[PDB]
Design a protein around this ligand. Sequence first.
Ligand SMILES: C=CC1=C(C)/C(=C/c2[nH]c(/C=C3N=C(/C=C4\NC(=O)[C@@H](C)\C4=C/C)C(C)=C\3CCC(=O)O)c(CCC(=O)O)c2C)NC1=O
Ligand SMILES: C=CC1=C(C)/C(=C/c2[nH]c(/C=C3N=C(/C=C4\NC(=O)[C@@H](C)\C4=C/C)C(C)=C\3CCC(=O)O)c(CCC(=O)O)c2C)NC1=O
Lengths: 482, 482
Amino acid sequence: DLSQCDREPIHLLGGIQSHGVLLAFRGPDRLLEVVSANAQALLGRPPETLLGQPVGRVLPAEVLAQWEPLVARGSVRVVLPAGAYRALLHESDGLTVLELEPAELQPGMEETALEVVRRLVSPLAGVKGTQALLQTAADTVRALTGFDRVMVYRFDADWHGEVLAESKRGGMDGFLGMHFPATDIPVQARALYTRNPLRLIADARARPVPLLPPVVPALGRPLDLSNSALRSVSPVHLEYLRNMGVGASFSLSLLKEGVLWGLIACHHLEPLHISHERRRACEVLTQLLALQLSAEERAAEASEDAHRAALLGQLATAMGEGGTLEEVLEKESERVLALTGAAGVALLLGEEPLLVGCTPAQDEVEALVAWLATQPFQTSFHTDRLGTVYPPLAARADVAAGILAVRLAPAAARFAIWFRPEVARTISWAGNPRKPAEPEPGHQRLHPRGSFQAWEETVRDTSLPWKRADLGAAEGFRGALV
Amino acid sequence: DLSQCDREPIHLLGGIQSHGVLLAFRGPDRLLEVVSANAQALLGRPPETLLGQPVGRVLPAEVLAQWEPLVARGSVRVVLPAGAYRALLHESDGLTVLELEPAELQPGMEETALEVVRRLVSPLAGVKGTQALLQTAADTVRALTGFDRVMVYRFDADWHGEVLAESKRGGMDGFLGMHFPATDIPVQARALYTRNPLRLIADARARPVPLLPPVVPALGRPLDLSNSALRSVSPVHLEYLRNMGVGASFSLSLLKEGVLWGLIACHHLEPLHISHERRRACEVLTQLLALQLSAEERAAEASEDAHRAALLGQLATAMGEGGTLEEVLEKESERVLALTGAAGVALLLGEEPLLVGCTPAQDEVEALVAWLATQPFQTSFHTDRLGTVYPPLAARADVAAGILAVRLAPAAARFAIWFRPEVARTISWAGNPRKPAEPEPGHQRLHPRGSFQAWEETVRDTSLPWKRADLGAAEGFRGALV
Ligand SMILES: C=CC1=C(C)/C(=C/c2[nH]c(/C=C3N=C(/C=C4\NC(=O)[C@@H](C)\C4=C/C)C(C)=C\3CCC(=O)O)c(CCC(=O)O)c2C)NC1=O
Ligand SMILES: C=CC1=C(C)/C(=C/c2[nH]c(/C=C3N=C(/C=C4\NC(=O)[C@@H](C)\C4=C/C)C(C)=C\3CCC(=O)O)c(CCC(=O)O)c2C)NC1=O
């Protein structure tokens, strides 16, 4: 892809986080083939001496005693001399990968998790606004994790994001309302986070633990850690966290109708480990937030659609109360404009355009119609930034930043064209977006930016976006005009 | 008809179930005001001798010690010699009402509850039909409760209901697909179940335990048990369960947008107690089902709306591509009828009615219009059983079991009328619905029916119901016809 940021193979860095141990076994005899360099933390022997040994000569008796539930369930609690660990199995590169990390210490964790689930599944949840839904999600994740700061981050259409909601303990700074470049979470990270929806960085200053040997011998590259809970993340991102002053990080993918919509991101000022089962409990909260957001958005669409049909019916009542079409459309100007949330409309019904509300002048409308008659758009054309495609109205964002045009005739230049002004938007970037990274001379090592201080820009010349309900209303009104 | 079934004051029967104890306290000194007759085994004293005594001389110290979180949270777990008990606190009739029942004994209950929550909130759980959502809810509630039979029961428009999905042990009979009279769950029960969304009948054969005294002395009537977990239910319902062969019963209200949509009903062949904590975990599943159903229904409405707008746009194009109306609408008959999912349409424009698709004859249409012209409706009229409200077409259920009519003029008999045939429906009732109860002579004591065996009827002369999207499409087409 575009950036050098996009090229780092984050699933092939060959490192795990220091609080866990990884062992990968090969074949029907379960021979140890890859092992983390710290594995004496649970094995007792130098890990290199155990490569090639079958699982029964490698793992502690306590783990072997749980082998059947581990294999059949993929996850089991094991009590080791170091304490309670969660053992996790997955498959990668033709190997069975066993990961061990400290297990949840609170027996009541799941009881607590169900209580916070009740907040997000509550009878009629989000009846205060979808902002209230986002805030409850941040608050419940903060309550369940104990992280200092929890943020709801939504990706915009160009893959840059903004913090929509924040929950944090007193005295903490935050990022509420701030925008971050698309390169802060590059394309291969977004792809990984669509498939693996959770990631914990327990200690942002800890050094990674390498795997032994550094390649899977059959493949000649490091073991694929895509599905590994212990994977050590990109060094550039660890520097980014350090530049933010963050000691530990935990994020969850928000997958809404199958696409990566955003993240819940959590920051702690000191190292902090969250158990596997507690991370999975937080995942339930994020899935519930996605479902609540979907329910509310679809309900909003249904309500908007009903309003559009009601307007079409009110306009039909007004027609045939007497008078010509032009008289009725002028008398019912507010209803005609409300069909598409517009500030003006031009109707080309055979003669000069009938201008209702705020439109460009007759000459400019006539020129736009002659241009529209050449473009290929079936029945409807819409844009929220007319000036980028139609330079004659680029300076007229006061009345024509966006248009929605519908055809009223197969070949003839007969149209209804609704108009919208620009909506200026002042946004605060977390750091200068013109300098989204600090590469070294030669552009070969790359570092994150050092500053996240607010940097203000105002976006101009773009209207509110045309909504699905606006487009349907316009198609429905074509029949009254044809 | 508010019948005898509806008048039983089920919140004032003055009894609790035998597996718990109830105590109600009055005033700043928390004097014992009401106590269940079985309370001696947990009070060490015969309960009547403790009325009027302060809570410190009534309750064991183990209860009073968590009084604060009990008042704060409404529920705590208390460990007594007889075992672990759940204490529940609510307010009724100016009294503080304390209930004690056996506590959950499985340490992993909530862990199991989260796992079934994941199945029901899977990344788009119910990805091939809401029927799959209903089955998953039945299956997960059965897994969590251990009840022999779990059914999803939906209330229809007349408050009779039907079993839409079922999960049951092998060898059980069931009620899948069967319909039950509205009087099976009478009006005051439905009202109570909208406010208190869970109820357990742990032993359908056990006798009620009376409260002492039999009235709240200040009020002269029994304590209001509307919000009591231990409330003994209507004796007629206990007889109903007996006649069904059911030994224990647990139901949860499905509240979808503030309205009682249905129930999840659970039956066991023998007595069975489900802890309060486990019931509330099942409540999460039922709230999640309601949320999933709402999300899917709203998404379906949005999709159907888009199809109607597309059809209106396609008709407008067809109208502009040349020809008389009579020619275009005949040629586009499929699309015009699809606007409202109809099988025919009559247009009362200028001359004789224009009939497209399957309609009554011209004379029957002109008989129908004059009847419509005197009916009170703003711009649209619709019914799915024309024959009841308009007998002249009761014989034309082949083409006109339902109609959707819209006005095309303020004065004058000008309409568009879409027509639908009947959809015959063969339904199985659980018992003869003409004999929904067995009253004793004098009609003063009622008993439930004795048989739930399938009793088949075929419902005729009713069309499919007219959908919100059909009404919106009809309103949107009015503009094209005026
Ligand atoms: C409040 C706003 C906010 C934002 C906007 C935010 C960003 C964020 N980035 C990441 C991850 C990564 N970033 C980069 C690369 C680069 N980052 C840059 O700045 C440039 C220099 C660059 C390359 C040229 C890579 C390769 C990864 C993948 C790491 C891996 O999985 O291996 C994560 C997930 C991890 C986590 O939860 O901590 C988050 C949540 N975290 C916040 O709280
Ligand atoms: C598969 C289908 C299916 C159905 C359709 C079904 C019905 C059902 N009824 C009830 C409750 C009550 N019924 C009646 C009265 C009458 N019942 C009759 O037949 C006539 C004679 C009559 C009066 C003339 C009253 C007063 C109550 C309130 C009890 C209380 O709360 O005190 C409940 C909730 C309790 C529970 O989950 O077990 C359910 C679930 N249970 C199933 O499984």
